[PDB]
Scaffold this active site. Sequence first.
Site, short mmCIF file in Angstrom:
data_model
loop_
_atom_site.label_atom_id
_atom_site.label_comp_id
_atom_site.label_asym_id
_atom_site.label_seq_id
_atom_site.Cartn_x
_atom_site.Cartn_y
_atom_site.Cartn_z
N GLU A 197 -6.58 -8.36 -0.94
CA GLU A 197 -7.02 -8.60 0.45
C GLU A 197 -8.53 -8.49 0.42
O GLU A 197 -9.03 -7.42 0.04
CB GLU A 197 -6.40 -7.58 1.42
CG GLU A 197 -4.87 -7.58 1.44
CD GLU A 197 -4.26 -6.42 2.24
OE1 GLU A 197 -4.95 -5.85 3.08
OE2 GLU A 197 -3.11 -6.07 1.98
N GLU A 243 0.84 -1.24 0.00
CA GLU A 243 0.00 0.00 0.00
C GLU A 243 0.87 1.28 0.00
O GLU A 243 0.81 2.11 0.94
CB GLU A 243 -0.94 -0.09 1.20
CG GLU A 243 -1.99 -1.19 1.09
CD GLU A 243 -2.95 -1.29 2.27
OE1 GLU A 243 -2.62 -0.72 3.33
OE2 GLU A 243 -4.07 -1.91 2.10
O1 LIG Z 1 -8.80 1.49 7.14
C1 LIG Z 1 -7.67 2.34 6.85
C2 LIG Z 1 -6.58 1.48 6.19
O2 LIG Z 1 -6.09 0.59 7.19
C3 LIG Z 1 -4.98 -0.22 6.80
O3 LIG Z 1 -3.89 0.66 6.60
C4 LIG Z 1 -3.16 1.14 7.68
C5 LIG Z 1 -1.92 1.68 7.41
C6 LIG Z 1 -1.12 2.18 8.47
C7 LIG Z 1 -1.56 2.18 9.80
C8 LIG Z 1 -2.83 1.65 10.08
C9 LIG Z 1 -3.61 1.12 9.01
C10 LIG Z 1 -5.29 -1.03 5.55
O4 LIG Z 1 -4.13 -1.75 5.08
C11 LIG Z 1 -5.87 -0.14 4.44
O5 LIG Z 1 -6.33 -0.98 3.39
C12 LIG Z 1 -7.07 0.66 5.00
O6 LIG Z 1 -7.54 1.55 3.98
#
Ligand SMILES: OC[C@H]1O[C@H](Oc2ccccc2)[C@H](O)[C@@H](O)[C@@H]1O
EC number: 2.4.1.391
Lengths: 704, 707
Positions: free
Chosen positions: B338, B171
């Site tokens: 995912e 991501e």
């Molecule tokens: O819900 C917020 C995000 O929560 C995650 O991303 C993070 C990244 C860093 C810290 C906490 C969550 C998921 O991998 C992402 O897909 C999602 O959009």
Amino acid sequence: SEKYFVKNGQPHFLISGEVHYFRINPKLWRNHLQLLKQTGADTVSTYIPWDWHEIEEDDFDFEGKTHPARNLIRFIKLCKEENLDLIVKPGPYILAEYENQGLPSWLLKKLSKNAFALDENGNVISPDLVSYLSDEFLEYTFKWYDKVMPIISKHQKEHYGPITMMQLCNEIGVFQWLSGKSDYNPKVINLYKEFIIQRYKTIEKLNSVYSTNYNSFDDLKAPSGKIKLRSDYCAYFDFHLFFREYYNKYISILKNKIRSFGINIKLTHNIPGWIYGNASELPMLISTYSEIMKNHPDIIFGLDHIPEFVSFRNAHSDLACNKILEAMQPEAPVWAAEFQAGTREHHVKAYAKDLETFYIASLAHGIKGFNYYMFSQGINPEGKGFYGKTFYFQTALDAASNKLALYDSIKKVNRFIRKEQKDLLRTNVNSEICVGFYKPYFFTELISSQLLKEKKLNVEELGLYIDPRFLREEILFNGLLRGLQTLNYNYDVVDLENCDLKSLTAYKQLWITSAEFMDAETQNLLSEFVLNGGNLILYPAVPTLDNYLNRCEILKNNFGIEFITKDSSHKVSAFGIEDVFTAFSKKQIYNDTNSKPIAFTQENEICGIRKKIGKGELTILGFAFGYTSDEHLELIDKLVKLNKIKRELFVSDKDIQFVVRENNKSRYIFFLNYHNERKTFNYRKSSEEISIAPFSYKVIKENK
Amino acid sequence: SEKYFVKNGQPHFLISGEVHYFRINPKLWRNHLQLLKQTGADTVSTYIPWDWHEIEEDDFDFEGKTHPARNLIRFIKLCKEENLDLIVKPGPYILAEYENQGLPSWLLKKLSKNAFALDENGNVISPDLVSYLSDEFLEYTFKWYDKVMPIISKHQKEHYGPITMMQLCNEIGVFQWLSGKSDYNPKVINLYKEFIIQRYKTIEKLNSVYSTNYNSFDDLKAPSGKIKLRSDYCAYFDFHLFFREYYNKYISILKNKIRSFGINIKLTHNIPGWIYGNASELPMLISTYSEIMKNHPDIIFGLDHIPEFVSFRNAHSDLACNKILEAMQPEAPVWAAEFQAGTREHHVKAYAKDLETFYIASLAHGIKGFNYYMFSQGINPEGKGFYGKTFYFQTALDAASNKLALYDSIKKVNRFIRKEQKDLLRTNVNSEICVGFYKPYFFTELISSQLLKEKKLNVEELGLYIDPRFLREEILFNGLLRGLQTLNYNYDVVDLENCDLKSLTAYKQLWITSAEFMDAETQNLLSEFVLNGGNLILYPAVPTLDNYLNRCEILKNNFGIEFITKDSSHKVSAFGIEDVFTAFSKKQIYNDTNSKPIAFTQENEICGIRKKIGKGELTILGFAFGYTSDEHLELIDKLVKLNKIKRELFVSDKDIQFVVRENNKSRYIFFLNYHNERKTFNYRKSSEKSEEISIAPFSYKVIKENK
Ligand SMILES: OC[C@H]1O[C@H](Oc2ccccc2)[C@H](O)[C@@H](O)[C@@H]1O
Ligand SMILES: OC[C@H]1O[C@H](Oc2ccccc2)[C@H](O)[C@@H](O)[C@@H]1O
Ligand SMILES: [Ca+2]
């Protein structure tokens, strides 16, 4: 001991339905009222819109001379003929998605600039938005009251009319909340200056508290913009106090005017704060009425409950709100002035099977009366709707009085309530846990809110690290209160302001969610509570400052506490639970002389202790946790079990919520399934094997 | 014409399950794999955490020498023995609620301050957040790759190993999104300065576009603070363009390094954007990958779907996301890297009966592959959990490999997929409506987002009234796309950038949600679209500016439109619908010339017209509506019927969602009940004994027809 509505000298569950005569074809008024009565409802509730009846300046139509739906007199007459009591709400503000929020167009066109709420630059905030104490606004409000209040007076129950209650205005201060903008009308600011002079007496005293460098009160300006200095925080804190007095001045003026007409029925007000189906901000809105509630024992506040759906996502919102209202208004029944029926928003569905479960959960959660809002859909006359033509969707009745899916759910729940009300209204839950409500943490609608886009409060710029809104939303509302409800432990909330020590001693534990600041009176109260034999759970901080962020270490010193604030991993261990995630790197590391260490940082520094003080017990956790892991539920469960507190029932499925309501003769067990799963479980006191559908409920009666 | 995975020259539905070997007792690895295989899954997917395997600087364990669960080599061999292909994800970032997002504690302790992402003051944004192009970060990332990549290379499918795909990092930019804080690392700001010099060549040229008065490029500083002038908006816009080039440079460097190990498997990346069960911000996150997707045809992006529940409150999120990915990545299958199984958060329940419907809705909504995340729960070893000991809840298997409720839901869905995949993967929906995706409206993650706290973009200060984030969230995502799905009208999304006219000409209608700005290329494209025979629906504004808010009236002049912007009541009438609530007081008021007026303000001034231009049709509405009233659905329905577009079915309950998917051989009818009501309804096909159906709350039916 319980507070409840009374009819014919017996407990009465107030069942009202909102039916807007001004949005319904008058040929169908009788049909709507008959269908409402046939659900078992006893009362009907409506606004009486000022814009609708004062059609031009000093031209009033209450008889349908100019439009048949202006025949308020006929509607009142029909309520009486159809054996419904009537709640009337003549404003001046009604909101209700009515154009200009219920104020006449002719009025808003005619008022001078200084009748409007103004931004700090002197610009009109909204062509909709008057200054509540504007001389001109109140004069016109008084001329409306002079016409509508004689009609309301004549139709009181006293005079065998149907009218039993009246609401003053509507959600006072809701426009300051939603916008995050204070009214800087010079008349408001003059009243603020008077409040400040009255409070401090001399500029020397205000300077000593605020650390300001004024030569006189003439130097003092209303706070605005972001808080950068502790002196800005002080000024904004008193500005919040001022608005609570300001709102009490406003409702007092309306109330005194109403009483002059011989109107002796119950007076009401209504509390906003739900949005997107969450109520974690509603406590902030409750807090804006602190001065009204202290000064008007005879004005009953009810809740505006807007759950939108019913699941584990929002299950804790309505209980937490009902408990906090009980804390602030202990001498009146907890009731819902607006109790969701259908949806204000077409795209935000209100399912009959969701709302039916909400209605039963509301009984479990101590509600004593409600007004289905909206029982009947409306059609906005002549584009008087702020939004489309239609007012509400998926109601009990459409605007043409067609029955909709919710109708049979309301009839079913009402039949249950009528069958049980005599005993159910007299039941309470046995709470051995008390949770402190510290109102100053909630006094932030002008500086820190879910609705305020701008963050005017940044505690790190003030040398603090515990933000009161983060504390009250995540550690208290969505943390402790959510956790206790999920774990099926009863709690009560207590307003710590002027709190009677004798009222706290009934409880086995008092839980205080504390920031770094707490007034002397509350530090003294908690000191005395523990010394006299109370069990205090205090986190995430021993406070060291007062409400003005000046040194106040009464609780710290009285308990023999010493700490250093140090940075560590977010995770701690507590009572042998490993990997408890905490909100802050910074934690309080306690000297453990005469103490038992019970929580540890990753480096094994002591971030929690237990201690005997006088006859009582102290548990201090120097870290912040809410409910975002299973370890949080484990930790709350261990804390409750420190003082041998037990759930009423053993229930085989931990994800079933129950509430046991009892009096001397009667027990109700409310089982609530907030999950998309058919659950089968069994229960016994601390065959008997039951199945509950998704998002559903079951009520069991036990004679004692 | 469908894009789908192929196995041995046949359509293959990629069914993967996420199983974290490093969070499972290795004595139970085989049982987890066997149980995943028994659901009909063909693939297993796992992170390879750098922190887990480089236990101290230059001390590597992939063989379980220092902890049994460090035996990556055995886990790979077990995947092969249990006839599962393997997706590997070695980072360097994995996130995965692992301490330090997967980076070694020893690394973050050792790195000097200029390895970290910095705010404008030069303060570390987060002790876990490196600067992607830090020399120090990349040197250590490369030493990690030097040890893990030879293992991955040896165990690739072409060497008879199980590994078929590898994710690069995790991501990219998700941290810059969630903090709303840009990286001002000097390495980054220097790359930005080079980007600006390359773009403009001379300070005079930059000054002409921005309306600035710089004496030299040395006077130009990275933008920060609120946008107050059109010049600030121009600087921030190029800063967004620069970050898309920056992420492409990062992924390019990792890709070049990987390929040097003889690794020829499919490379992947994963799109964040769901939060609180809503994906309305995801299109902003996918826009941050615009330059990667143009430059790397061989990196397949998959979606990270986190619906949390399945109701009308979020029903439109997954379809709008699947369609937007197809628009940006039209040459690869739409897949979920995912695909929610269980819940990452104990307090945020994931019900098997919700997720089962989500899985079927995803099939209806054109998904071609997915990776159940998390198929297997894990227990964090050695305190490695960011948030607690337990990794995920309500999964298909618990950490011990016990079947939980979701296991039978996944087996049911997988069984249908395996029975039908040969036809189902080849099925299309007949979309007669195309919706334009105008990427520049999405380029705001540094200035305007649901997650940014300090809002830096206030268009009213720029003499504008249509905010691009309000437009793309409420008028497009929660408005038009939500409305079309609710009304059961199929739509496709097309990226308007370098868009071939021939790809637009197949549709009966093109819908463009326009702000007051739009580049000359896109104004020209839409002009040609209509002149050559296209039917265009355009609202709420004819644009009059370009991406730098300088004059560009190409479309206005090509369509022979004259307008004035005037304040009126929010409510308009349109096509005979009264009291249509619109978002703005300001509306475009059009000259009636050579047009039919079809919308009126409260003063009966003309705020919408229809006209014939060359061989085409134009419908312009000078007002903004999403879907916040019943009148909005009535208006969308009216607009669609202007070109006699019909639904595939007559359905007696308007609250039932359906999708018809078909090829030459087969027709699948998907019915979706996003409502807490048991619904009994009837339906029939729009051409050519109505069938009756009863559907549970939050449930689905699938009907297969031969021919
Ligand atoms: O819900 C917020 C995000 O929560 C995650 O991303 C993070 C990244 C860093 C810290 C906490 C969550 C998921 O991998 C992402 O897909 C999602 O959009
Ligand atoms: O959802 C926000 C609020 O929505 C309404 O209040 C307003 C007031 C002004 C404009 C819009 C909504 C409800 O009366 C109030 O109960 C609620 O908390
Ligand atoms: Ca001591």
